[PDB]
Short mmCIF file of N, CA and C and ligand atoms in Angstrom, two decimals:
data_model
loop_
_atom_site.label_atom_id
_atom_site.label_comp_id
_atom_site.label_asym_id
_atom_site.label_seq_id
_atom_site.Cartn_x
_atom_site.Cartn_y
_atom_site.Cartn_z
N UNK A 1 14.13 31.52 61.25
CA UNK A 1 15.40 31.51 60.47
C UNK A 1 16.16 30.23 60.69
N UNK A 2 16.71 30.20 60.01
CA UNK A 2 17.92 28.75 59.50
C UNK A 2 19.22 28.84 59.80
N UNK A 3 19.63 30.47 60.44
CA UNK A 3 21.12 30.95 60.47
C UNK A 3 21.09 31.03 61.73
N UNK A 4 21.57 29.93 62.46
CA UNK A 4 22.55 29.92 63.29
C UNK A 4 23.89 30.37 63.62
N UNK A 5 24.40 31.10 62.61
CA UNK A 5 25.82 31.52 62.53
C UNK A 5 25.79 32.66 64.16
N UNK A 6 27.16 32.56 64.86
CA UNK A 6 27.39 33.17 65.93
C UNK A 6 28.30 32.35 67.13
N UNK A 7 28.40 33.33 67.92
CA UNK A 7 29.61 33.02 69.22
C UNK A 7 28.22 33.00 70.07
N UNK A 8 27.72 32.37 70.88
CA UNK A 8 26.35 32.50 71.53
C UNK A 8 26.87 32.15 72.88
N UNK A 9 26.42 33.23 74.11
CA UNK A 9 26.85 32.80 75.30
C UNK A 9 25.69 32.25 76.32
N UNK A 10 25.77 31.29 76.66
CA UNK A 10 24.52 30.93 77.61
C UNK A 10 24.09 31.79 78.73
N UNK A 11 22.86 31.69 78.61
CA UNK A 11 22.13 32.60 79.63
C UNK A 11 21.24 31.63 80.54
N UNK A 12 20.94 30.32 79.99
CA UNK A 12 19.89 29.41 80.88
C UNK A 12 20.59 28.08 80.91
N UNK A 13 20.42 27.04 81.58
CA UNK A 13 20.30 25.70 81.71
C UNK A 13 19.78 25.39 82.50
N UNK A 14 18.98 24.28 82.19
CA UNK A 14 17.90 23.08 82.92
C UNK A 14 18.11 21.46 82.67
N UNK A 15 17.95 20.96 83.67
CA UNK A 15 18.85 19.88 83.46
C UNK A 15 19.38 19.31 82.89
N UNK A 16 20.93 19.98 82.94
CA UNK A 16 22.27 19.98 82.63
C UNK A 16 23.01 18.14 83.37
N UNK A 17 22.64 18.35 84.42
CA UNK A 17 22.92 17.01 85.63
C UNK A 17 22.34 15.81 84.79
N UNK A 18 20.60 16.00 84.63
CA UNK A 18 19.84 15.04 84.27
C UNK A 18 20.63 14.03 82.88
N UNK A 19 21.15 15.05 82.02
CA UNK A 19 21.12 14.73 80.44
C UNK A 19 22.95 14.03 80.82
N UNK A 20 23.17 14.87 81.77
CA UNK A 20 25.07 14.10 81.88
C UNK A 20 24.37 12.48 82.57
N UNK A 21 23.86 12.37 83.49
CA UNK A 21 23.74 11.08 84.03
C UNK A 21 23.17 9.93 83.36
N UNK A 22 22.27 10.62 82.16
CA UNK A 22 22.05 9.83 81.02
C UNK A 22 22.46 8.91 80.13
N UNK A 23 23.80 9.95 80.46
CA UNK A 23 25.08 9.63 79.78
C UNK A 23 25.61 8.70 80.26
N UNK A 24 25.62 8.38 81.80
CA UNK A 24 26.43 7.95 82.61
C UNK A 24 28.00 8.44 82.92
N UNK A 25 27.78 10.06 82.48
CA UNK A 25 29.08 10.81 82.93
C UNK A 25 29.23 10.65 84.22
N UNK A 26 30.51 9.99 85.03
CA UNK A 26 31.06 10.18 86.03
C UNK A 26 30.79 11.28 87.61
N UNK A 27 30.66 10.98 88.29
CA UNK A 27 30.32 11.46 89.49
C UNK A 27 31.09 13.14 89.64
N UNK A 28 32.28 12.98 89.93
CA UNK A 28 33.32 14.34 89.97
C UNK A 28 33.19 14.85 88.83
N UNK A 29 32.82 14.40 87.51
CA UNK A 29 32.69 15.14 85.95
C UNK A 29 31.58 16.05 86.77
N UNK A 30 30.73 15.40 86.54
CA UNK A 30 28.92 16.02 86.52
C UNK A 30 29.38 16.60 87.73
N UNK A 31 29.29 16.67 88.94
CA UNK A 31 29.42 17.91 89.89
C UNK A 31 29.99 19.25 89.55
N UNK A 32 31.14 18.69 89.00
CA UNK A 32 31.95 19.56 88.39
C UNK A 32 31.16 20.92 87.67
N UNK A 33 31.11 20.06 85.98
CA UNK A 33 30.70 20.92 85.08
C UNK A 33 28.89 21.07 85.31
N UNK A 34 28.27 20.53 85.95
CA UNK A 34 26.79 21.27 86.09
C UNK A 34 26.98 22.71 86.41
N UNK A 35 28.08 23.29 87.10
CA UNK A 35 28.39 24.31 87.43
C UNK A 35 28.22 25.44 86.51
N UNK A 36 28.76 24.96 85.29
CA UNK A 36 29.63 25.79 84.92
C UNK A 36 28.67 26.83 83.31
N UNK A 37 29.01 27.90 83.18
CA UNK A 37 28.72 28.85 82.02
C UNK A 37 29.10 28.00 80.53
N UNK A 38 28.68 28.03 79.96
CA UNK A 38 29.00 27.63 78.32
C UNK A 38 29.04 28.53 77.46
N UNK A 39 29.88 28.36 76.22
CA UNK A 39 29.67 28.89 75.40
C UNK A 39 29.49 28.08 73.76
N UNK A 40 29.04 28.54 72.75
CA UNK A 40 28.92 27.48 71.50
C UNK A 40 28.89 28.39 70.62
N UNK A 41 30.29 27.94 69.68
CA UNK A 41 30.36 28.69 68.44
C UNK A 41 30.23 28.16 67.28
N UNK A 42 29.31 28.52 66.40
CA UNK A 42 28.56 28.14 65.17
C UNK A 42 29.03 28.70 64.35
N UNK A 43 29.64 27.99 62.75
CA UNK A 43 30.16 28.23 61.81
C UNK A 43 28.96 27.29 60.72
N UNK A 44 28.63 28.85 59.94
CA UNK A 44 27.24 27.78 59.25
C UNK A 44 27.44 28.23 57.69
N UNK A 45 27.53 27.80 56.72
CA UNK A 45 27.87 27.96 55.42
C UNK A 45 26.82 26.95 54.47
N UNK A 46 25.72 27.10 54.11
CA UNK A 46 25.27 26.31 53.24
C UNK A 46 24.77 24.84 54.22
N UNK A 47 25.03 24.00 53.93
CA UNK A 47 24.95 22.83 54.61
C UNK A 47 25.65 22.02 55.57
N UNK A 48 26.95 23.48 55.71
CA UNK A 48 28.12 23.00 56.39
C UNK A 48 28.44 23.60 57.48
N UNK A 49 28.39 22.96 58.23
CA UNK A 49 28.48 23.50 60.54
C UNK A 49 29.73 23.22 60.61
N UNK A 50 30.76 24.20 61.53
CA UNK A 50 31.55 23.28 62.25
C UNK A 50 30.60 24.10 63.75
N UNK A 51 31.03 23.33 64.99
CA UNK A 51 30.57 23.95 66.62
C UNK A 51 31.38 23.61 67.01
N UNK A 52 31.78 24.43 67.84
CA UNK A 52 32.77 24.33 69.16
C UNK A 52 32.06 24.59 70.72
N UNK A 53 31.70 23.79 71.36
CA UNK A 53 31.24 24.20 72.54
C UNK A 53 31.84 23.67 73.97
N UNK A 54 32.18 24.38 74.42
CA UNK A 54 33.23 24.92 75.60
C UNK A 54 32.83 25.72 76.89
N UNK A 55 33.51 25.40 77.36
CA UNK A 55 33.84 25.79 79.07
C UNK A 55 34.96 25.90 79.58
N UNK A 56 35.43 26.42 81.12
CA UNK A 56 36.57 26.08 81.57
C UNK A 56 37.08 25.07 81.46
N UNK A 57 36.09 23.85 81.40
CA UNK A 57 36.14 22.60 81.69
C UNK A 57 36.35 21.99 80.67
N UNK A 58 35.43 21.67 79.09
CA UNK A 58 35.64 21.17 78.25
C UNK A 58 35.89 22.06 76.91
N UNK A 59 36.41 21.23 76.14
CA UNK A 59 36.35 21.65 74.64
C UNK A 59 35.75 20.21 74.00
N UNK A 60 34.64 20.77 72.88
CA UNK A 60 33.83 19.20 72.09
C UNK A 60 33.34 20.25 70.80
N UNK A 61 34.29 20.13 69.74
CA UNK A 61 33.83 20.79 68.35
C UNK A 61 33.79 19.23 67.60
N UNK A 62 32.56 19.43 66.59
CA UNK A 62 32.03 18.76 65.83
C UNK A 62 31.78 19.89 64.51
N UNK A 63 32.46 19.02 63.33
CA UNK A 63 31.53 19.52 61.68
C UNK A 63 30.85 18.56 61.39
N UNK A 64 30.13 18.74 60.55
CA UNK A 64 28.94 18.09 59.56
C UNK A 64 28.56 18.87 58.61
N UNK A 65 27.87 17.97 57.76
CA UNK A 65 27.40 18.05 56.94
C UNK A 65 25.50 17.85 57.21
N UNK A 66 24.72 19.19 56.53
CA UNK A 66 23.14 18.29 56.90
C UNK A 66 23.00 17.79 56.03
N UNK A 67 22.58 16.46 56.22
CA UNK A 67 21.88 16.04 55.28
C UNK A 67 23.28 14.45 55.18
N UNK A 68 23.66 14.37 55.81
CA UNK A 68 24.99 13.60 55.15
C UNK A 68 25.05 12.79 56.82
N UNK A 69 24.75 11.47 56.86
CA UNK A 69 25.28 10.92 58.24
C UNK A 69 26.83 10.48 58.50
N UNK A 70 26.94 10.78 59.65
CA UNK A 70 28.52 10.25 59.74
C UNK A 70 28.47 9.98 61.01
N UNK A 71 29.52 8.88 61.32
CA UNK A 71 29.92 8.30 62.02
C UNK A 71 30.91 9.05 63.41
N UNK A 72 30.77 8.71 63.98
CA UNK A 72 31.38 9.81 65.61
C UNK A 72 31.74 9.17 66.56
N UNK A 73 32.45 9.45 67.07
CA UNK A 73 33.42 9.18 68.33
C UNK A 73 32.69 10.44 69.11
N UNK A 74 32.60 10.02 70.52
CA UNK A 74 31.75 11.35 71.18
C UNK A 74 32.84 11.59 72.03
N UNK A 75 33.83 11.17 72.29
CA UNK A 75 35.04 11.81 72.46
C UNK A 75 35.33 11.87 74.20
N UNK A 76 34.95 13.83 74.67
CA UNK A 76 35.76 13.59 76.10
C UNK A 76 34.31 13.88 76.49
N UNK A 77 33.11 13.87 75.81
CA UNK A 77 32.16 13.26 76.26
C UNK A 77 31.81 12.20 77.04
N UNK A 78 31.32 11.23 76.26
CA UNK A 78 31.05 10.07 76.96
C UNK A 78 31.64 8.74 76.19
N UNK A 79 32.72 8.78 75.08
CA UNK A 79 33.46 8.20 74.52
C UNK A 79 33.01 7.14 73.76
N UNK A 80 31.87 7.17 73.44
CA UNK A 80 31.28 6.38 73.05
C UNK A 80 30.99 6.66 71.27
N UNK A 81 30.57 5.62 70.16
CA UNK A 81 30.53 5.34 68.74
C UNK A 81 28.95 5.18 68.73
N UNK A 82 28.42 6.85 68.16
CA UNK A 82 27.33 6.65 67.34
C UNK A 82 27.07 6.60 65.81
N UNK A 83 26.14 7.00 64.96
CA UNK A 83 26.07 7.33 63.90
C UNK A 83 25.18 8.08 63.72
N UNK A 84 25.65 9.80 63.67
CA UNK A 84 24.66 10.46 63.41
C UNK A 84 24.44 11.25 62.51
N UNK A 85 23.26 12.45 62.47
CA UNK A 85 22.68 12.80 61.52
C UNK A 85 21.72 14.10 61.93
N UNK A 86 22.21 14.71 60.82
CA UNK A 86 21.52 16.37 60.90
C UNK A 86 20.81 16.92 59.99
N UNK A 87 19.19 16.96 60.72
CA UNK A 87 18.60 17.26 59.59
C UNK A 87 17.71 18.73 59.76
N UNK A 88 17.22 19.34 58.87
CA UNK A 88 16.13 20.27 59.23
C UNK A 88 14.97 19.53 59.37
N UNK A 89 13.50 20.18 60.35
CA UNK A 89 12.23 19.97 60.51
C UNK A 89 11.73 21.58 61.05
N UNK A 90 11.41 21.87 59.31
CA UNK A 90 11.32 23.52 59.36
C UNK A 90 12.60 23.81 60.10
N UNK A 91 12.28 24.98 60.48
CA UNK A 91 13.66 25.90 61.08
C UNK A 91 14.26 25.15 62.22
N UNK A 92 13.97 23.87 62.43
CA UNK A 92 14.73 23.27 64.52
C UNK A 92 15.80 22.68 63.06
N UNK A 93 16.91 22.84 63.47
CA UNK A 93 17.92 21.55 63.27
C UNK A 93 17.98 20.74 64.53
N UNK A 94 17.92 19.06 63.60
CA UNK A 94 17.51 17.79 64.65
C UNK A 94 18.93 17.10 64.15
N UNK A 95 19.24 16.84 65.68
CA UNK A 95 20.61 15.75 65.60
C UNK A 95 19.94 14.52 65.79
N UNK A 96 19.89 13.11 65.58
CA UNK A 96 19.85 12.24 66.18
C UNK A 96 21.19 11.68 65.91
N UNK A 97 21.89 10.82 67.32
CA UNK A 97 22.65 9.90 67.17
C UNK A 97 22.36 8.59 67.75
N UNK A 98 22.52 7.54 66.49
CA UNK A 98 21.81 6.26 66.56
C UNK A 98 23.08 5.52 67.43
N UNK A 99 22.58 4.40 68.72
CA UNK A 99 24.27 3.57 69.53
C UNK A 99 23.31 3.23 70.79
N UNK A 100 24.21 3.20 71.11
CA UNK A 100 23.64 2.43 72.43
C UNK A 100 22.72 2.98 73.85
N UNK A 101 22.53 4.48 73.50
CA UNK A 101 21.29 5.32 74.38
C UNK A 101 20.21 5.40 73.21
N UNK A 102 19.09 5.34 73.78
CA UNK A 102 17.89 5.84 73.50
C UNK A 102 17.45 7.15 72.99
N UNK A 103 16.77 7.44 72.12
CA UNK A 103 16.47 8.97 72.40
C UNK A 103 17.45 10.21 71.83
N UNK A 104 19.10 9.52 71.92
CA UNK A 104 20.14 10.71 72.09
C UNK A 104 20.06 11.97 71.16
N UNK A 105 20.77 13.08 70.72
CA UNK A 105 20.61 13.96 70.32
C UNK A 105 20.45 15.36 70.63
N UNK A 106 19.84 16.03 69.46
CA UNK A 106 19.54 17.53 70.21
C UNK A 106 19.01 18.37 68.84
N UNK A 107 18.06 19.47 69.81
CA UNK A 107 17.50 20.00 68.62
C UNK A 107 17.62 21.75 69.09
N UNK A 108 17.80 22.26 67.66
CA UNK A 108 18.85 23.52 68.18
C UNK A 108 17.72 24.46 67.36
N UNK A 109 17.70 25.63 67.83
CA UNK A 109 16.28 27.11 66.94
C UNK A 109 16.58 27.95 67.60
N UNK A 110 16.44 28.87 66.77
CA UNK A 110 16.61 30.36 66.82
C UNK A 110 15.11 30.93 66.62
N UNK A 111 14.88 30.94 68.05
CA UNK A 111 13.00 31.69 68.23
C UNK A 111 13.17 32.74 69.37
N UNK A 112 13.03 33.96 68.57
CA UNK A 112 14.03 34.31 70.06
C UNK A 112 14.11 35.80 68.84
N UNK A 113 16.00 36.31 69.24
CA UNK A 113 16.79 36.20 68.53
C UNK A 113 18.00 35.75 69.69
N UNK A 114 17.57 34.57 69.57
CA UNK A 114 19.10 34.08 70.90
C UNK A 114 18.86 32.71 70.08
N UNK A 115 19.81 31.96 70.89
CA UNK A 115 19.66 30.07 70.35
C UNK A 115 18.91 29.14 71.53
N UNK A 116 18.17 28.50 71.20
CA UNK A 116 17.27 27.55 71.79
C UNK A 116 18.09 26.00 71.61
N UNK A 117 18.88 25.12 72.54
CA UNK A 117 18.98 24.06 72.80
C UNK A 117 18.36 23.39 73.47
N UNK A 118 18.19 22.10 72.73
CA UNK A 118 17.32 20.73 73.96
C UNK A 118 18.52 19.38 73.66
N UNK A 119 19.38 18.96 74.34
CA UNK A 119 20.26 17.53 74.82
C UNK A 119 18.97 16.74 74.83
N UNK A 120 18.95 15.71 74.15
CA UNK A 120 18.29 14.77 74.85
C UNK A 120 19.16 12.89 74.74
N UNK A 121 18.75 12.07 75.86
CA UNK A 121 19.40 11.06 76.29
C UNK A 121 18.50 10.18 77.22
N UNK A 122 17.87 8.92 76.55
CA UNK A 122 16.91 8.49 77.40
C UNK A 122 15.80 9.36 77.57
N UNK A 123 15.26 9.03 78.99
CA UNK A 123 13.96 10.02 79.57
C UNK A 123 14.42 11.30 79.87
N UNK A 124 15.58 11.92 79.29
CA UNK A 124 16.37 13.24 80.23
C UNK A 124 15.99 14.09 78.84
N UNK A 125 15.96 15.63 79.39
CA UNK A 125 16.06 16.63 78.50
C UNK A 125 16.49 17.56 79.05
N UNK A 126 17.57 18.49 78.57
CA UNK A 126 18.27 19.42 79.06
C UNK A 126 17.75 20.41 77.95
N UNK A 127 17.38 21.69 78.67
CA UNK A 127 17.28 22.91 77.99
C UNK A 127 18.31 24.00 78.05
N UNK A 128 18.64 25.24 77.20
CA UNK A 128 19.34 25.58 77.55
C UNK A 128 18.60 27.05 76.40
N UNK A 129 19.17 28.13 76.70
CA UNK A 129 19.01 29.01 75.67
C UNK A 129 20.72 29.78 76.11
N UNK A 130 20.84 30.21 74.82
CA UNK A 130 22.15 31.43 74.76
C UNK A 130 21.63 32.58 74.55
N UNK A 131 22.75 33.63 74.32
CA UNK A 131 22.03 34.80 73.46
C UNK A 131 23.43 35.63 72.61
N UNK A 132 23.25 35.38 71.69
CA UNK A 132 24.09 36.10 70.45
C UNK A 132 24.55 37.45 70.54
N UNK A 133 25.64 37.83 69.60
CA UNK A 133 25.78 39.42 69.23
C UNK A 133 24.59 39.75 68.90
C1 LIG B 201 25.07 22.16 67.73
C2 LIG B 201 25.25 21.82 69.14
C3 LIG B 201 26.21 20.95 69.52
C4 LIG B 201 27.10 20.27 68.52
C5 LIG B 201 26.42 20.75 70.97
C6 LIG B 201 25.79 21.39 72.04
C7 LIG B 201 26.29 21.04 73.29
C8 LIG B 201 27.30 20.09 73.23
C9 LIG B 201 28.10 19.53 74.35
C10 LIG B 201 27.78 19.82 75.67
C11 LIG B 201 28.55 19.35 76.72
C12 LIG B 201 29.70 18.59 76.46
N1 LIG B 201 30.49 18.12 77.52
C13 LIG B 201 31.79 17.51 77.25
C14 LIG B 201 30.03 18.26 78.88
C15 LIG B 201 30.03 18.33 75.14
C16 LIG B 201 29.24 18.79 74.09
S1 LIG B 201 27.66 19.71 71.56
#
């Protein structure tokens, strides 16, 4: 399936650390939030996402459009100006954001009936699965 729609609460992560240092997130950040539970809420309408994904720690909502690239500020991320882009390959939706890491992005599926995330940044890949209403 293609419907991602849901409040999805994490149940797994695997390197979480790896994909922040990728980043070159900060020492006290990354100790910090490797810690911590997530959650990611998906608003999916046609071609149109907004996500909100959160913690005690952060808030980082992004909309898009698939199929439509746009330009981004990655905010209280890693503050940095990519240009990215969301596409389908079959049922994975694939982010790439094109800037100054390698690799960056993430590819999101519903194989399961939970959500399947992979971060990727450089040689790093963070896995993660949630699990839905
Ligand atoms: C569709 C999935 C999206 C937009 C994301 C999944 C995880 C994201 C994320 C994780 C961690 C942070 N911080 C600030 C540690 C921000 C965003 S976005």
């Amino acid at each position: 399936t293609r419907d991602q729609n849901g409040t999805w609460e994490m149940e797994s992560n695997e390197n979480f650390e790896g994909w922040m240092k990728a980043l070159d997130i900060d020492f006290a950040t990354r100790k910090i939030a490797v810690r911590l539970t997530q959650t990611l809420v998906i608003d999916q309408d046609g071609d149109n996402f907004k996500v909100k994904s959160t913690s005690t720690f952060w808030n980082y909502d992004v909309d898009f459009t698939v199929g439509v690239e746009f330009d981004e500020y990655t905010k209280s991320l890693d503050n940095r100006h990519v240009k990215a882009l969301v596409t389908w390959e079959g049922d994975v939706l694939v982010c790439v954001q094109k800037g100054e890491k390698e690799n960056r992005g993430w590819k999101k599926w519903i194989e399961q009936d939970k959500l399947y995330l992979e971060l990727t940044c450089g040689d790093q890949v963070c896995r993660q699965v949630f699990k839905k209403k």
